[PDB]
Amino acid sequence: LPPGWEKAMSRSSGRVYYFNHITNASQWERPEPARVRCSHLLVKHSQSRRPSSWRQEKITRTKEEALELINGYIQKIKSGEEDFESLASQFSDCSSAKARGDLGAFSRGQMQKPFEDASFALRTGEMSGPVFTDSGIHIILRTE
Ligand SMILES: O=C(O)c1c[nH]c(-c2ccccc2)n1
What residue stretches are annotated with the WW domain? Predict the structure, then answer.
C-alpha cells in the first residue's frame, strides 16, 4: 500500500476501508514528485498562531468547533452537494480563499510540515481529511 495507507475496519458496517495516517483521508477502495500544487480550505480556531482572518477580526471558535466545521465541509464536498473551490472561496480563513484556495506549486522545505507531508502523500485529484497545523485545521486538495 502507498505511503501512509493502512487497512482498517469500519465500526459502523464491519467492512474493510483504508485510512491514510499522513493525509487523514479515508476511502472504501484499496488505494514521490519534486513539486505538487495544492488548494486548501483553512478553518482557524482560538489556539491558531494568528486567531484573525479576512473573515473575522477575532476568531473565537474552539479547536473542536473548527473540526466540526471542517468535517461538515468534507461531507458536502464528498456528497457532491458543494465543490471544494466554492467552499474554499466562501469559508477558508486563509487569504488564498480569493483564489479558490489555490496555493500554486511548491516543493518540500516550504510549508508547515504536517501540511507539506499531507500534500506530498495525496495523489493528483485527491483530497485530504482534516490536517492540523499551527495555522488551524485544513482540507487539502492536490491539483497537480
Ligand atoms: O495565518 C495563518 O496562520 C495562515 C494563513 N494561511 C496559512 C497557510 C497557508 C498555506 C499552507 C498552510 C498554512 N497559514
Answer: 1-31
Catalytic site includes residue 21: no
What domains appear along the chain, each with residue ranges and CATH number? 1-31 (2.20.70.10), 35-144 (3.10.50.40)
| Structural biology method used | X-ray
Establish whether 112 is a catalytic residue.
yes
53, 96, 128, 135: the catalytic one is: 135
Q: List Cβ neighbours of 37 (8 Å cut-off, separation of 6 or more).
A: 102, 103, 104, 105, 106, 142, 143, 144
How many angstroms is the resolution? 1.8
Looking from the CA of residue 48, the nearest atom of ligand 1 is: 3
